[PDB]
């Protein structure tokens, strides 16, 4: 049962490594096991150092494979993806299928985060729905994956010092316990705490202000400083904004913007970077350029 299911799971992993998508029944079973394995973990899914943490992906499977080559194979190195891996990627369904297969294979050697792009309306209007209708013909895979994104967690904590998330801070929230008391079993609203969690962004401003993205707010240096002294966090690692060097430090080394999807939309030509935290909590940056095709 479990042993043969694990062996067939490894077969699916090998096929996905060989870039071939699975069957609809396999997708249904994988999503079922993913629901049963993602329900248990809380909103602040604690991940323990050492770890390799990774920014946006956005369905660029070849760059994701190069990132695997950079940072080690999934059985060996712990990984942490921080969202946006379903939208406007060409092998986007293969990418998300690989990610969920890796999660249900190694529940605790990897953990994934939920970005703003992993929701029904955003997927419909930015083409993941189009991709899966082109590939599988029907929308069953689409509704499976969106139901799964209804169950994806919210924020990651590294050793009580690093706060990993996609968007950023919010004036609605003050504390990790409020993050815990939030309920995530709902597709993201256009207003509210989950909304500005997945839609915020940094600035050198000070105070708050409305984002140009139409959802969520934009925080300032002193706001981030106040948050980190309030909850004892030492560094907030977020991944939603595209950068050229691959990473940026903001708010006199309190916010780390990570981007790890090189050559954004195949035209921007940006680099990509990922962090690796070694077990005595020592950080290192790995940078790379997209692989030849």
């Amino acid at each position: 049962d479990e042993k043969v299911f694990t062996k067939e799971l490894d077969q699916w992993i090998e096929q996905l490594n060989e870039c071939k998508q699975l069957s609809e029944s396999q997708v249904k079973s994988l999503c079922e096991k993913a629901k049963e394995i993602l329900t248990k973990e809380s909103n602040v899914q604690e991940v323990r150092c050492p770890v390799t943490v990774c920014g946006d992906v956005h369905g660029q499977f070849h760059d994701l494979m190069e990132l695997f080559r950079i940072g080690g194979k999934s059985p060996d190195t712990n990984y942490l993806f921080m969202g946006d891996y379903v939208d406007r990627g060409y092998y986007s369904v293969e990418t998300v299928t690989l990610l969920v297969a890796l999660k249900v294979r190694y529940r605790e050697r990897i953990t994934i985060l939920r970005g703003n792009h992993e929701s029904r309306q955003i997927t419909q209007v930015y083409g993941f729905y189009d991709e899966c209708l082109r590939k599988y013909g029907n929308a069953n895979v689409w509704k499976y994956f969106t139901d799964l994104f209804d169950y994806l967690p919210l924020t990651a904590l590294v050793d009580g010092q690093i706060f990993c998330l996609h968007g950023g801070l919010s004036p609605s929230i003050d504390t990790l316990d409020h993050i815990r008391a939030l309920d995530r079993l709902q597709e993201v609203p256009h207003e509210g705490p989950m909304c500005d969690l997945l839609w915020s962004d940094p600035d050198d401003r000070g105070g708050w202000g409305i984002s140009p993205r139409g959802a969520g707010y934009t925080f300032g240096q002193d706001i981030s400083e106040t948050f980190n002294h309030a909850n004892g966090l030492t560094l907030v690692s977020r991944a939603h904004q595209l950068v050229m060097e691959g990473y940026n430090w903001c708010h006199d080394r309190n916010v780390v913007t990570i981007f790890s999807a090189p050559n954004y939309c195949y035209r921007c030509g940006n680099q990509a970077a990922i962090m690796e935290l070694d077990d005595t909590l020592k950080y290192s940056f790995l940078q790379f350029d997209p692989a030849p095709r």
Binding site: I122, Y126, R213, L242, C265
Partner: peptide
């Protein structure tokens, strides 16, 4: 395609 940032 006109925009890379999802301004919406």
């Amino acid at each position: 395609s006109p925009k890379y940032s999802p301004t919406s």
